[PDB]
């Protein structure tokens, strides 16, 4: 019924109250010290006082760094932002790599705002323009005022708008007899639909029909919102939302990512600090996950060691799969985990350890229960032996085809014959490499 | 339309117990690979497991693309099947991760259920009122049938759909409310007014009976990438066709993911997972393989079908050399279907099926000669020689292609090995790798 | 008759569950039987209000982008509006910069150099450079020879707006390519046309894929005006940026004149029709849902956003012959929101706190919402929140002679934990 995405078995770090790790909780098997360190990091996030703290989840494949990052995200909650990333994301053909890095940095930092908006809404009973005096002159608009009659329950008001408001009014094609919604903060207006006081069974435009809006007109409504700092930056750089010709023309163009200047970021920070001190804003710093950090070259790391030392930069977590390898972008620096020694002093290494046979067997059992296929004990032991012998991942991916073969065999039980048929149909990396070695057709 | 290299494969040739038949659905051979491909097909048809990488391995001229295209044929309509190649990723407007993400979003489909309304009747009277500049329009349309008559209001789109493909009083039209389509079925009243401009009068139809408004529910399929680009900009519907969409932000991605899950839980949308097929996946780069190994771990990721014809070869962008050109971390994620070379009976069945699909009456001895040629040189050469031999037989005015046509075609056109020997025999005539040549006979 | 239905947690309910489950150290307090035991109590009522339904404890308001503005607000026979949205970022400039670089001045050389570089030495000037203008007049077939000087000295948006429909000279070298002839031959073409249907696939894809009824999926989070520029002590800057933000040709081009106004100049003021300032050039959005970023709160999203109200409206769709009652202590006396729900959309004959005698004369008016010998109702829906069946039995004791039980459950929430301990107690 529900699709499994190789991580649905993970619900949290599974720690106890004192920071110790239960052996089985949240779909985690083993990795006790890694889980405790990640829980300490989660507590450090919920402290919400630090800036530019970084950790590296060192370890081999099939070990659980990515699992630990999503476990951190599950434990932290969807209110605090989490920005997953891959190292190949940072290379863009439209803007510099470093600006993509800082854009992800300010995607990570969140904000909690509560704003009051002046709102005009009601049914349009009257809509009469006023003509201008000199229409063909063209240095003024063709109208001067528009009188609008708005009616709702308990209140009724007449509205003498500026022509610039009537621009948006005509752009939403407002007719007489529909319920509209003027937002006085930006001048935007939304046409809800035709009012249901009249007949609603004779239109041809599949319009939605709405009752009269409750409450008076000039409703002042307070709403709560969650936005990121990057979204403020991209709204102020590409100013869509006003009712001036710059904003109306900026809606129509195809947006390109531009190098957002630092001055915009200081102005946004000053405005946000005023919102903090005024009392409607509360900062929510977040967590940014750069997976496959070996793929980043020397320029990103060189900029990263300066970008982490700012007052606002979030906590970034890093994953590496390689050991003692050369850094990309250079040809002489040989460094652990593909990470230069300049960055590694800022970095707090969290090691992860490989698995035993029993841990692999329990992981296969929980992954089979999450994928809603029940297994036999000898077949589970066989899959555990293959997981020790080939890899954990190959034993994980083979679970669904033997289930398919089981439904083919008109039974719900997985037997060892299904496992042997999964061995015979599909191959791991090692047998494929040996088959490449014996053949001369460059198979 | 036209006959291509893969015209003959109609299905995977597979029985209901997931066992391949020897020769069915336009396929032969590769019994274990056919069984594994059917298992992957049943996995897709279940549609509850996401991001299972499947790799196909084998020598060239073995049937890898034939296997994948048979999977696409037996996969059924209205379920997405992208067939990208490895070289198409490297663009000047997208990033490679962005191009992979767009292929991923193209591969996954949404079956939107929509409620519509059909009206069909005899048109009574049109009352289109327009402004002086013609920009703003409002009208009243009046339509009847044998039973009852209704007066409807008009909007901008319906009036402009009445203007183009112009409708007069006396016509029978059908309007769909959800799509806004206008289908003039014909002229029924046959009115006495005949303007000299109208020369195209539609055919007479009986005016319809029964109620005008008939309830109807229809389903239409739209992929995730199309919804993504539609919500991306103001004019997004053009960017499907011009392809000027690019570097789309992650915000619209996550918001559309939430909205898609919303439409799923209220019953509007039924997600069907698809298949992304990347032919010649050894052509890709190491950054692309990094994004691929980190991109299958989402719920909105399809079954990825990969193909290679390389041995232990160099992984691109990197100094080292890896099995199939694919790195070890990606190779561990994938599960490998293997393919093995053919023999004389399977090759004979291949050319017989091809010549049946190539409408060529081939004689039996010429078929034996073509099989010996195919085993001797390659399957593709003996596949290609059939149409040429047919043309040569057409030039000699005999329908049946005989042995002398095959020998003349073999003499006229060269295969790989004979061309290699002919180059090696007199290499001074051709331009050398060092750019040296002799263009004079003396 | 006893029946039980169990329900899956909906998406917004599950995300509210997670965001208020996180806290700092909750230690799963409500399913640690804190409601059974007797701050813990605040987490217990928070988990209960989340686990029932969101709108029973905060209103799902409108969906709008965050207005990054500093507009004229109030503290709370017509009330009038002027558009006064400004960005909070004020870029302040000195007056020396403007008055010594941009505006002309007696000691400045802006206007002199502007004319000297744009008129005296423009290569499209026919007064100095005739043969080049005649060269392009032969090429492009332009009727007027000053048109190249006009095009070379006009802003791009303005030059786009005053687009001329006049055909060129017929002896020109402008040879119309076959694609332009294809586009012009189908400019007003009917259906059932061979060249007509080849050259519109976007309208076919529109009508086939039902794009006229699709919904808005994305709205921006922050919308802003352009950043205001604030020069102190000059009105010329105010006039200039007010003219540039609201140029009447550009604003009127993205506009439409009202119909009775077009009556007024065309008939009453006698203005010729082609001398109207041109309008209607704003691009049409894809749908009515794509016009504006503000999303109204939908009634159907209230119906479908709950784990239990969805199956509840399914059940009262199925249940017609028996009047039924709801134990409203699943949310501790929340009558209001279910009241709005079932007289907004699922309207029925209803009674809620002479009261007990109204539903027995006829079963067309259901007993509906009461807070817990009136067993004359045909049935009662008492469903969950019972970690003790004593109040359950005392509620069903009050309750025709037949009694029917309708039990509701949500999996993954606290109802499985209190309703697995109390299940063995029954």
């Amino acid at each position: 019924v529900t699709r499994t995405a190789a991580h649905t078995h993970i619900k949290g770090l599974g720690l106890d109250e004192s920071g110790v790790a239960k052996r089985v909780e949240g779909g985690f098997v083993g990795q006790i010290e890694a889980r405790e360190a990640c829980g300490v990091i989660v507590d450090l996030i919920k402290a919400k006082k630090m800036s530019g703290r970084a950790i590296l989840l060192a370890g081999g494949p099939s070990t659980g760094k990515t699992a630990l990052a999503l476990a951190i995200s599950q434990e932290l909650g969807p209110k605090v932002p989490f920005c997953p990333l891959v190292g190949s994301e940072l290379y863009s053909v439209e803007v510099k790599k470093t600006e993509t890095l800082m854009e992800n940095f300010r995607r990570a930092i969140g904000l909690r705002i509560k704003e009051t908006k002046e709102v005009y809404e009601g049914e349009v009973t009257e809509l009469t323009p006023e003509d201008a005096e000199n229409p063909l002159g063209g240095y003024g608009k063709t109208i001067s005022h528009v009188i609008v009659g708005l009616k709702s329950a308990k209140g009724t008001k007449t509205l003498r708008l500026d022509p610039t408001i009537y621009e948006s009014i005509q752009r939403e094609k407002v007719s007489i007899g529909d319920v509209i919604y003027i937002e006085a903060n930006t001048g935007a207006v939304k046409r809800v639909g035709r009012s249901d006081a009249y007949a609603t069974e004779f239109d041809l435009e599949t319009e939605e029909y709405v009752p009269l809006p409750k409450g008076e007109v000039h409703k002042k409504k307070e709403i709560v919102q969650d936005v990121t700092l990057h979204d403020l930056d991209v709204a102020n750089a590409r100013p869509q939302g006003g009712q001036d010709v710059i904003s109306m023309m900026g809606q129509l163009l195809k947006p390109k990512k531009t190098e957002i200047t630092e001055k915009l970021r200081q102005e946004v920070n000053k405005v946000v600090a005023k919102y903090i001190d005024q009392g409607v804003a509360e900062l929510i710093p977040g967590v940014l996950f750069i997976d496959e950090v070996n793929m980043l070259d020397i320029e990103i790391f060189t900029y990263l060691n300066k970008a982490l030392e700012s007052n606002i930069a979030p906590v970034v977590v890093l994953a590496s799969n390689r050991g003692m390898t050369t850094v990309r972008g250079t040809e002489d620096v040989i460094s652990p985990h593909g990470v230069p020694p300049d960055l590694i002093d800022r970095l707090l290494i969290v090691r992860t350890l490989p698995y035993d046979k029993d841990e692999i067997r329990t992981i296969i059992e929980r992954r089979a229960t999450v994928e809603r296929l029940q297994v036999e004990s000898s077949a589970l032991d066989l899959l555990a032996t293959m997981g020790t012998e080939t890899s954990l991942r190959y034993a994980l991916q083979l679970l669904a085809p033997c289930g398919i073969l089981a439904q083919t065999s008109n039974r719900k039980e997985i037997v060892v014959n299904d496992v042997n048929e999964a061995k015979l149909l599909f191959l791991d990396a090692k047998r494929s490499t040996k088959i490449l070695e014996t053949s001369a057709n460059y198979l | 339309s036209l006959i291509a290299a893969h015209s003959h494969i109609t299905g995977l040739g597979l029985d209901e117990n997931l066992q391949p038949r020897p020769t069915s659905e336009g396929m032969v051979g590769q019994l274990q690979a056919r069984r594994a491909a059917g298992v992957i097909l049943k996995m897709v048809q279940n549609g509850t497991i996401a991001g299972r990488a499947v790799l196909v391995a084998g020598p060239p001229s073995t049937g890898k693309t034939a296997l994948a295209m048979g999977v696409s044929q037996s996969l059924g309509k209205d379920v997405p099947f992208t067939a990208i190649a490895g070289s198409e990723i490297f663009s000047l407007e997208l990033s490679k991760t962005e191009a992979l993400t767009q292929a991923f979003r193209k591969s996954i489909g949404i079956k939107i259920k929509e409620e519509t309304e059909l009206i069909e009747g005899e048109v009574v009277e049109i009352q289109i009122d327009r402004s002086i500049t013609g920009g703003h329009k409002q009208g009243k349309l009046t339509i009847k049938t044998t039973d009852m008559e209704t007066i409807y209001e008009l909007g901008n789109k319906m009036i402009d759909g009445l203007t183009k493909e112009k409708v007069l009083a006396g016509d029978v039209i059908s309007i769909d409310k959800a799509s806004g389509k206008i289908t003039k079925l014909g002229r029924s009243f046959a009115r006495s007014r005949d303007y000299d401009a109208m020369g195209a009068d539609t055919r007479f139809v009986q005016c319809p009976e029964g109620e005008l408004q008939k309830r109807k529910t229809v389903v239409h399929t739209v992929s995730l990438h199309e919804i993504d680009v539609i919500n991306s900009r103001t004019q997004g519907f053009l960017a499907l066709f011009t392809g000027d969409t690019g570097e789309i932000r992650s915000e619209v991605r996550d918001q559309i993911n939430t909205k898609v899950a919303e439409w799923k839980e209220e019953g509007k949308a039924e997600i069907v997972p698809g298949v992304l097929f990347i032919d010649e996946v050894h052509m890709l780069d190491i950054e692309c393989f990094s994004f691929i190994n980190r991109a299958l771990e989402d719920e909105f990721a399809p079954i990825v079908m990969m193909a290679t014809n390389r041995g232990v070869s160099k992984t691109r962008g990197t100094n080292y050399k890896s099995p199939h050109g694919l790195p070890l971390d990606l190779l561990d994620r994938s599960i490998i279907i293997t393919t093995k070379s053919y023999n004389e009976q399977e090759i004979k069945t291949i050319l017989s099926i091809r010549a049946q699909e190539e409408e060529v009456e081939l004689s039996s001895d010429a078929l034996d000669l073509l099989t010996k040629t195919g085993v001797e040189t390659s399957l593709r050469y003996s596949s290609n020689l059939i149409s040429v031999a047919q043309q040569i037989a057409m030039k000699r005015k005999n329908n049946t292609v005989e042995v002398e046509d095959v020998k003349r075609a073999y003499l006229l056109f060269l295969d790989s090995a004979r061309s290699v020997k002919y180059v090696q025999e007199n290499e001074s005539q051709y331009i050398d790798d060092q750019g040296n040549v002799q263009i004079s006979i003396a | 008759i006893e029946i039980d239905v169990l329900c899956d947690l909906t998406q917004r309910q599950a995300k509210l569950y997670q965001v208020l489950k996180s806290q700092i150290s909750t230690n799963y307090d409500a399913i640690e039987n804190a409601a059974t035991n007797d701050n813990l109590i605040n987490a217990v009522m928070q988990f209960r209000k989340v686990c029932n339904h969101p709108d029973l404890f905060e209103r799902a308001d409108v969906d709008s982008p965050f207005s990054f503005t500093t507009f004229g607000k109030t503290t709370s026979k017509f009330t009038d509006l002027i558009y006064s949205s400004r960005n909070p970022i004020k870029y302040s400039l000195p007056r020396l910069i403007y008055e010594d670089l941009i505006l002309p001045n007696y000691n400045n050389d802006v206007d002199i150099a502007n004319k000297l570089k744009n008129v005296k030495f423009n290569i499209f000037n026919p007064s100095t450079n005739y043969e080049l203008c005649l060269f392009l007049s032969k090429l492009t077939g332009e009727p007027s020879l000053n048109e190249f000087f006009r095009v070379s000295t006009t802003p791009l948006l303005k030059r786009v707006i005053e687009r001329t429909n006049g055909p060129k000279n017929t002896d020109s070298l402008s040879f119309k390519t076959i694609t332009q002839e294809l586009l012009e031959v189908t400019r007003n073409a009917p259906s059932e046309g061979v060249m007509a249907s080849l050259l519109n696939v976007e309208k076919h894809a529109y009508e086939r894929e039902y794009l006229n009824c699709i919904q808005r999926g994305y709205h921006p989070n922050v919308s802003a005006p352009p950043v205001t520029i604030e020069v102190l002590g000059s009105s010329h800057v105010t006039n200039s940026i007010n003219n540039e933000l609201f140029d009447p040709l550009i604003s009127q081009a993205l506009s439409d004149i009202p119909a009775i106004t077009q009556y007024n100049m065309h008939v009453k003021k006698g203005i010729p029709v082609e001398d109207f300032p041109k309008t209607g050039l704003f691009p049409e959005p894809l749908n009515k849902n794509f016009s504006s970023n503000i999303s109204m709160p939908s009634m159907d999203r209230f119906i479908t956003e709950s784990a239990k109200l969805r199956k509840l409206d399914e059940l009262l769709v199925k249940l017609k012959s028996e009047g039924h009652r709801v134990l409203i202590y699943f949310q501790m006396t929340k009558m209001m929101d279910l009241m709005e729900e079932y007289l907004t959309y699922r309207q029925y004959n209803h009674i809620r706190l002479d009261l007990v005698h109204d539903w027995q004369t006829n079963p067309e008016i259901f007993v509906f919402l009461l807070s817990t010998n009136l067993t004359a109702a045909d049935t009662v829906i008492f469903y969950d929140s019972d970690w003790n069946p004593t109040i359950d039995s005392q509620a069903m004791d009050r309750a025709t002679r037949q009694v029917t039980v309708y039990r509701l459950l949500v999996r993954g929430t606290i109802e499985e934990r209190m309703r697995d301990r109390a299940k063995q107690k029954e």
Binding site: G177, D196, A197, Y198, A199 | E125, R130, L168, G170 | -
Partner: peptide, 28 residues
């Protein structure tokens, strides 16, 4: 009681009228 039809403000407009016998055009 059946709700009234929506008001039809068409003042300030030309008129295309097509009927069974003959087609009109009212202009300004």
């Amino acid at each position: 009681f059946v709700k009234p039809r929506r008001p039809y403000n068409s003042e300030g407009m030309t008129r295309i009228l097509r009927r069974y016998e003959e087609d009109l055009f009212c202009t300004f």
